[PDB]
């Protein structure tokens, strides 16, 4: 297609469209012309990706003002799906128009997923990979290597070829997705990490995780070019406040405090050996403190900066000396002040939560140490570490964490909350004290990014209500519309199984353990699907520990045996790699003959980044509802601040976020308008909150689908899939709900200009 | 109110000499209580129906039959050109009962082994019949699919009330990409119609492969009655056919020669194929008030068609579905029976 929105040609890579898509493009452009936030709903059943990217390229190429676009996905996988998607958009755009592209838009995740060095790649923990690519390609490594040629120092050499060819120019022309980017860089034996990091100043669009825009320790290197007048989208931004309050989170436990004693004693050792051997450069750095924050080499560090910035992007900062801490030995002294004051705060008999300032004044009474010097903990630590040109960091992971800790607590107040639980009750009456601390206001963390940028776009495949977020994140929006799925055919049966066979009102909220009434209820429901359902079926659970009790006692039942006769079980497991291997094997089996089943937490990690086609997804089941106050009171005080700050009480938000995770896991099954399947919920409570379910989803919920029995539901899906396999394709009824190529869009809309 | 094939493409070349192999699944799946007697016995029933249907309409083709049970697949009929072998095989099966589950791979591979001696003019198609929700493979699947469609064998499958996209993908492979062959059902009338269309030779947009001649001759009926003697069953044959060159006696059959191995039919079978060579333009229902033809049927004589305005009823179906190239009438039963049994358009044959 090459059509218009009255102002811009649109090179839609599909001859086909859906009317909802034109609704989407119209309202999103109407926004962009007046740059704003304008919370919206776009169903993932249609791939809004293409709508987004097509309109964005049209707008950026067409209007000459915003040459830069920001598209924040949640995860790297969303990014790469969008990457190949945009690649198709770009190839079609070239095919239709010849070559007008001159276009370079790239994503970036980390060395952990991008370290082309093999030895580093064989490691598993991303922190050690980060430090190791540092050391391997360090602004220091190169020097001591070059004045002193020795086998002590090495490099990926990927940074070398980067320096050589890459850092004068850019990639040839391509939108090199992780596939294409990694292939091409390997063919050029390059370091894709540093490639994108340097490339940042030229890409016409950019993509990355939310975190790179959210964690100021990494959301720091943003340039104005990438910031000033870019255009910013968020997709699947529904589960964002988790990331916000996580980015402003810090829990503790004193085994790390022993590790930090180890590190800080080691720092006593390093200061001793260097100062005896030479303190002269240390005094050079003393005068470098005396001149101030030392941006001369505290920020002018092409590879040096050791400790990243837990604080918001340098906004909550000053530049003076930390007073007496000019002496690095005074520095280590106050390091111990901290660590072991933390230790004395570590073993309270019971739980205690702290405001930063309350405990802060407490500490001053206990130990008269001061906030403004205290903030300089992290930066002073990093600079001293560099001046020690250190060879190891593992002893000092705790030290950088505590730097982060002290910096935030000395920095942030009256929005956050320290809390000190002397154990995990989950293994109560044992020592596992926790000095957890975190924020409570996501709008705070977001506010800098809103402040920089006007033309911000929020869109998730779950968002409801479109007002909760304006409350929580306290922001202005304009066009808050939800797009009801215009379809002339059912194509999805959500149903609320409140009644099992025995019609027992069901839930997991009774408890985290067994009650063979509901147990066999759910076993019967499961196995009856297991027979009737074809390949591809995953049900989601409130909690891994709850699902674990249930699954163990169901292995105790024969309830596993019949599904083992028919289909393939896949279960969830805490290990990321083996979870993923289960995932891919599931996919291969279901696309193959033998049907495969996964089952999982609505909070589960796959439900974050993995979508489901027709094959892998047919029948999803939300057993109970994803609540959490099984777990701790951090959410209790979270709600406390909520109520005293937001006009939202506990149950309201518990329901809100539980149904958020619900619809979040729901959305996967659907790919395109040849997509379909089952959606079942299994608990009583889903009737009251029928209206909190997103627009199209609620449309698929007729009240006649409420509190069905499980046997009638078995019948429902029986006839449902009987229909679904059938090619009821009049294609004369598809024009109105697909708006066939170049005409029904043109016809209706150019007429619909009424 | 019509649901009609708009373009009945048939004037070309369909698959005539089809080496058809129905495959059966006799598993615990075929037991289950969703069909009136069962899936299983009903399937045996409609399979017998298809034996008769096929060997009638494709009276020059061959067949072997295979079932699947207990994670294993089981042939029930050698490649046979006598229907009754298949018929009594099906009988012998119906009384045997299903067990276990289908080892789809083994059935595919057994069929693969079977249709190899089929020459070019003899074409290769298998016929799945599926009602299970899973398979049991011992050999790599898409491996064998590659082998299969690399050896030019499209397959038509008839699954029960589900969908299994491996079936659609494998068919699309076997059917040169284009797919219509994963027909599954929702009703038993639906089931038999599925069969009846499975009977006909199947074109899509043919890959222009080798068009090879086929040579044969024709035998002749015998005269002596007492002279009973046979060379195809070695039994008593009171009178029958006589190979055109090998001049052996053959008990009544359209088979290939059992001495010099050449095909033997009379002509009738060619004529059935021709009935499948140029089928006709569909009888268009004449426009309601603009038709105004003679008020009866031509092919038959059916004076009913309208009541001349009863506001609603007569203004409904001015039913004069009359031919296209001949424009000569034929009533609804006449249209159905012409197009069904004797396509034989007399009005078009008339001139
Ligand atoms: S950026 Fe270069 S040095 Fe660092 S991990 Fe990647 S390949 Fe290795
Ligand atoms: Zn004989
Ligand atoms: Zn002969
Ligand atoms: Zn008639
Ligand atoms: Zn005619």
Coordinates of C-alpha atoms in Angstrom, one line a residue, chain B residues 9-21 50 54 57-58 61 63 115 121-128 152-158 171-172 174-176 178-183 194-207 211 273 276-277 279:
Chain B
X9 CA -12.5 -26.0 -13.5
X10 CA -12.4 -29.5 -15.0
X11 CA -11.5 -29.1 -18.7
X12 CA -7.9 -30.2 -18.4
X13 CA -6.2 -33.3 -16.9
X14 CA -6.9 -34.8 -13.5
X15 CA -5.3 -37.8 -11.8
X16 CA -7.0 -40.8 -13.3
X17 CA -5.0 -44.0 -12.6
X18 CA -4.6 -43.4 -8.9
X19 CA -2.8 -45.9 -6.6
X20 CA -5.0 -45.1 -3.7
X21 CA -4.3 -46.4 -0.2
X50 CA -15.9 -45.7 -0.2
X54 CA -14.2 -45.6 -5.7
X57 CA -16.1 -44.3 -10.3
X58 CA -12.4 -45.2 -10.7
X61 CA -7.4 -47.9 -10.5
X63 CA -5.9 -50.0 -4.0
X115 CA 3.6 -47.4 -4.0
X121 CA 1.0 -43.0 -15.6
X122 CA 0.0 -44.8 -12.4
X123 CA -0.3 -41.9 -10.0
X124 CA 0.3 -42.0 -6.3
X125 CA -2.0 -40.8 -3.6
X126 CA -2.6 -42.0 0.0
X127 CA -5.7 -41.4 2.0
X128 CA -5.4 -40.7 5.7
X152 CA 5.6 -37.0 -5.9
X153 CA 2.7 -38.3 -3.7
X154 CA -0.1 -36.0 -2.6
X155 CA -2.4 -37.2 0.2
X156 CA -5.9 -36.4 1.3
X157 CA -6.6 -36.6 5.0
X158 CA -9.9 -36.5 6.9
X171 CA -0.4 -31.9 2.9
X172 CA 0.6 -28.5 1.6
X174 CA 2.5 -33.0 -0.8
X175 CA 0.1 -30.7 -2.6
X176 CA 2.8 -28.5 -4.2
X178 CA -1.6 -25.3 -2.4
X179 CA -3.8 -26.8 0.2
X180 CA -7.4 -28.1 0.3
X181 CA -6.8 -31.6 1.6
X182 CA -7.1 -31.3 5.4
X183 CA -10.8 -31.5 5.2
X194 CA -16.2 -35.8 2.1
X195 CA -15.9 -39.4 0.8
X196 CA -17.8 -38.7 -2.4
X197 CA -15.5 -35.9 -3.4
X198 CA -12.5 -38.0 -2.3
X199 CA -13.6 -40.3 -5.1
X200 CA -13.1 -38.0 -8.1
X201 CA -9.7 -37.5 -9.9
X202 CA -7.9 -34.5 -8.4
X203 CA -6.4 -31.6 -10.3
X204 CA -5.2 -28.3 -9.0
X205 CA -2.9 -26.6 -11.6
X206 CA -1.0 -29.6 -12.7
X207 CA 2.8 -29.7 -12.6
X211 CA 2.4 -37.6 -20.2
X273 CA -13.0 -41.2 -17.5
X276 CA -14.6 -37.0 -16.1
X277 CA -13.0 -35.4 -19.1
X279 CA -18.1 -32.1 -17.5

